[PDB]
């Protein structure tokens, strides 16, 4: 069991916003200069049902552009927002608002996208005991941001990276000897770390179990083999299933009762949520 | 017409790669210590047809991790890579390679994804005079990256941001005035006006706009517009367009089609790095 990302660190939210504003704004929003320099009002809708994620970023965009803009949130991160509902309201300067706009909803679109994908898969497997794990198949620079989205949507965090946990693969098993060696060396270095071994075989699974691993990733097992594995592993090691899984394969696998299902699809791809800022 | 992005500026590539390595690596890849401190070989394969994008990022990752890794590219940025073809070959240290892998893949799968979707749409409108344009609906921090992924795929760049061209939308909008004050402030920029109807289009033409964006027109009204605008202003059609509606719009003969889908969504190409 890994650390769960239940908030993105501020310094990471800040830097990501900063760089986002720059790439878009540079010397200045030239078209905003054509708008009356006054206060007004605005609000943001979804056009579709969604799991909100991105409050912190949107907030940070406001904060960096014009602390004068007041925001009120009608929904918070990790909530199911109904299609056509207002997520937040704005009161402030027209120019600032028109400038904040695209950046703000580019963060919500994305992260709510990620959260909403996750939630789908989760509802798909809500009847089974299985849980959803994410991966490192992330958008660069958005490792933590996406771990957070996935949590926001119902999913739990597989290891954050290469440092917090051990993941022993074919490539690793091949080198410095096989499985027993690998795990043993791995405990010797740091005994506090979770040791996971990926396998392609039931035989490799027995090894990793025999070597006293903490959890075992099943790479591309047949249904039947997953069944075998579960029997073998019950009470011994935690099991996580990997095999390019999507909304169309997850249920069959979840019916097996493996503890965990790894899914890169939930971070790898993005289905952005359709948003709109209504300014007036 | 607009600035086209045929290369991502070095520092952008550097800063991106640096932060993505940091976020993955931290104090260091602990699992790599189990692997032999030996030289080996590897290759990266695509498991589907695809347009390649992200060379600069893969290279730059190598450079930050271990300049002792040798890379050979069998396909370059903006080529069509066939399913199951190798993209590049590595000769180098097992540990450095195992550690570089995911960040490397994470870049190519993303940008080639963007270039690949873009290419699909282009092929769809292949038989018409219509050209594909992008938007500002990109991934935070990947503005230039994705303008480049789009160029790589056959698409063309709409303005880069809020600084390089005018875009008079409903909120700024009357029209005549707004255009006039724009050329005052800066006669040197493209003035674009987004319209919701044919009367506004008349206004924007009458005000000598550079290009005009049609927001959610019927086919019929798009037809009319085209007729009106021939030889006057360039037309661009925005209306939440996807692979399923682009052809109908292209048949109209409008100059440009605006698609946010090509960058706001991400369909990652499937990749694998076979080490050894």
Numbering used by the authors:
A (entry chain B): 7 to 286
B (entry chain A): 7 to 179, 184 to 286
From the primary publication:
Francisella tularensis, the causative agent of tularemia, is classified by the Centers for Disease Control and Prevention (CDC) as a category A select agent, and its role as a biological weapon is known to have been investigated in the United States, the former Soviet Union, and Japan. Here, we demonstrate how a combined computational and experimental approach based on metabolic network modeling, ligand- and structure-based drug design, physiological modeling, and whole bacterial cell-based assays successfully identified novel antimicrobial compounds in a highly abbreviated time period. Third, we carried out homology modeling and X-ray crystallography to determine the structures of the selected drug targets for subsequent ligand docking. methods, three proteins [3-deoxy-d-arabino-heptulosonate-7-phosphate synthase (aroG), nicotinate-nucleotide pyrophosphorylase (nadC), and d-sedoheptulose 7-phosphate isomerase (lpcA)] were readily crystallized, and their structure was determined using molecular replacement.
